[PDB]
């Protein structure tokens, strides 16, 4: 249920380094 | 070149 | 990985590395899929060709870990195999057609900053994300070049490709079960998966629900980072109906 969500990411609302990049190739 | 793991764990 | 970058601390706390008992070294990349569940490439466990056949015995699974060599007291956990499962149609004498081994621990792992499992795709997510120029992530603590080692985790978002790109990089007949990804020798960026990163995720954040998915296992390549290769991938959807088989027995 709480799968693929990251503590020290999704979970605080903090993004990653390069997150976005993957974000901007799906359109 | 790994550093020792505790033994418990061999 | 080539042409990647250290990763940050928590970034992939479903990164699992395959551990050599006797000699102490790195075998594979491998994923924490739950609390008593690891997923790898059936490559790391059975390759005739190399005379590899692991039993239980011979492997440990060290979860939550950043630096490669350092022993990470009070963040990573090592754990103790119960069994491996290999997928019974998977072909190494070949292309490594359903590259795919699930490993049950002996006891759950417990669940903290640096450890959390990753999600497995549904056929949607598969569907949704599986198009060629989206990117995955790929992590791992193999070769840095295919002709030294990280001292932590390395981090490579790279493209997915066209089947038929995939196709015509190779003679390795290509099939169904496999997807190839990385940059075309026109794109100007590089990277790669290495000797060492075989068995790891090839992750991407679905942008409907914000979860992490494994797409893919990493799997092979003609060498590594190499122009007019491509790294190719367990198609981790495809495969599914035989993890949930596993899981459901034993
Ligand atoms: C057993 N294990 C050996 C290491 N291996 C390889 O693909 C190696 C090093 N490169 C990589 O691992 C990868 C590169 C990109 C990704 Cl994704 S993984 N590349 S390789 O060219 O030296 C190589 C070594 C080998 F033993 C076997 C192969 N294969 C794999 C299946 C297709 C036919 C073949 O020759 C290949 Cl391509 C994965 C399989
Ligand atoms: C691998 O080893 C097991 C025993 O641990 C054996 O039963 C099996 O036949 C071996 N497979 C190959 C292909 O060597
Ligand atoms: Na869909
Ligand atoms: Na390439």
Redesign the interface.
């Known amino acids: 249920a709480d799968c693929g969500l990251r503590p020290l990411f999704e979970k605080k609302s903090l993004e990653d380094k390069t997150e976005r990049e993957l974000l901007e190739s799906y359109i | 070149d790994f550093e020792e793991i505790p033994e418990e764990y061999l | 990985i080539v042409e990647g970058?250290d990763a940050?601390?928590?970034?992939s706390?479903?990164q699992v590395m395959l551990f050599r008992?006797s000699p102490?070294?790195?075998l594979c990349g491998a994923s924490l899929?739950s609390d008593r569940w690891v997923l790898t490439a059936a490559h790391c466990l059975l390759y005739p060709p190399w005379d590899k056949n692991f039993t239980e015995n011979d492997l440990?699974v060290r979860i939550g870990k950043h630096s490669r060599?350092?022993?990470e007291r009070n963040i990573e956990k090592?754990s103790?195999l119960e069994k491996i499962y290999i997928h019974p149609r998977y072909n190494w004498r070949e292309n490594l057609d359903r590259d795919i081994a699930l490993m049950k621990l002996k006891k759950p792992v417990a669940f903290?900053?640096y450890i959390?499992?990753?999600?497995?795709p549904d056929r949607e997510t598969a569907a949704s994300?599986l198009q060629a120029?989206?990117?995955?992530?790929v992590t791992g603590w193999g070769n840095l070049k295919e002709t030294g080692?990280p001292s932590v985790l390395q981090?490579v978002?790279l493209?997915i490709v066209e089947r038929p790109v995939c196709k015509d990089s190779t003679r390795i007949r290509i099939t169904d079960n496999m997807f190839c990804a990385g940059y075309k020798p026109d794109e100007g960026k590089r990277g790669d998966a290495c000797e060492g990163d075989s068995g790891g995720p090839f992750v991407?954040?679905?942008?409907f629900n914000?979860?992490?998915?494994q797409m893919g296992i990493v799997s092979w390549g003609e060498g590594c980072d190499r122009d007019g290769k491509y790294g190719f991938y367990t198609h981790v959807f495809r495969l599914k109906k035989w993890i949930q088989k596993v899981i459901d027995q034993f």
């Open positions: 970058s940050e601390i928590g970034m706390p479903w008992k102490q070294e790195l899929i440990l060599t350092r022993y090592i103790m903290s900053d959390h499992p990753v999600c497995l994300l120029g989206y990117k995955g992530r080692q981090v978002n493209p991407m954040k679905s942008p914000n979860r992490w998915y």
